[PDB]
């Protein structure tokens, strides 16, 4: 792919494929040219050293990259573990945010604050559905502007989209299953995700700079699960031992 500015940013599988095709194309010239056998033995053993640096690089002299000094990345190094598989054991994810948490002790046990600046960007495509069903905007491009100017009506439609829609708060080093719980949001103003006090002892969170990612369950079978299975009032006893986990801290 060409980087912006005139310079290209290739992979490093194009150096190991361009070296198998040279030493293999020269080995055809050397055989139709009838070279002495002392040379076409240095080409067979030199060809199959380039093919064995392609598949798994490192079980030999570790053919260092060109134009640099670090070893290239063979095919068996993309599959080979980074502590995780190439596929899903990692999945960065859409419809998400993150911000600082604060106290907000006025809440119930099943809700959480959520700024009006994240509720309007997490729930954007849900808003374009109301602004055309309710009949305010005409097309979906004309509605994309009303969510930019923040007219007085989009706050009326954003407050209605967030009616019974639970969101999944989750802290950074999720140790046990109580690191991901759901909460019914309530729009506050500011830029910090509030959080009930009884719940922070389960996340193991102090309020001195700790950030908390917030996801969004889209489908209809994924909101009846963030309400019956992963809600915050369904998790009052820890699963390690039956003793409670909502202890006033």
């Amino acid at each position: 792919v060409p980087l912006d500015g005139g310079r290209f940013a290739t992979s490093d599988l194009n150096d190991l494929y361009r070296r198998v095709i040279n030493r293999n194309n020269r080995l055809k010239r050397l055989l139709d040219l009838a070279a002495p056998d002392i040379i076409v033995r240095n080409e067979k053993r030199m060809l199959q050293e380039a093919v064995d640096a392609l598949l798994d690089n490192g079980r030999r002299g570790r053919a260092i990259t060109g134009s640099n000094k670090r070893p290239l990345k063979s095919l068996a190094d993309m599959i080979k573990g980074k502590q995780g598989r190439f596929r899903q054991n990692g999945k960065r994810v859409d419809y998400s945010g993150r911000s600082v948490i604060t106290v907000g002790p006025y809440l119930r046990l099943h809700q959480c604050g959520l700024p009006k600046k994240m509720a309007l960007e997490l729930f954007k495509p849900f808003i374009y559905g109301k602004l055309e069903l309710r009949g305010l905007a005409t097309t979906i491009k004309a509605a994309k502007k009303m969510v930019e100017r923040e007219e007085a009506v989009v706050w009326d439609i954003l407050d209605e989209v967030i009616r019974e829609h639970p969101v999944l708060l989750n802290r950074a080093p999720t140790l046990h299953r109580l690191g991901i719980q759901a909460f019914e949001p309530v729009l506050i103003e500011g830029k910090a995700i509030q959080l009930h006090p009884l719940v922070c002892a389960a996340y193991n969170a102090d309020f001195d700079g700790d950030q908390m990612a917030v996801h969004v369950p889209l489908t209809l079978e994924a909101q009846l699960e963030a309400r019956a299975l992963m809600m915050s009032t369904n998790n009052i006893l820890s699963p390690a031992n039956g003793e409670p986990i909502i202890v006033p801290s």
């Binding site: 240095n42 053993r45 030199m46 050293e49 030999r60 002299g61």
Partner: peptide, 14 residues
Amino acid sequence: EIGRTTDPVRMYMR
């Protein structure tokens, strides 16, 4: 004399 040498430079030089 065939001392478990891998790199093809030394194997070609000798």
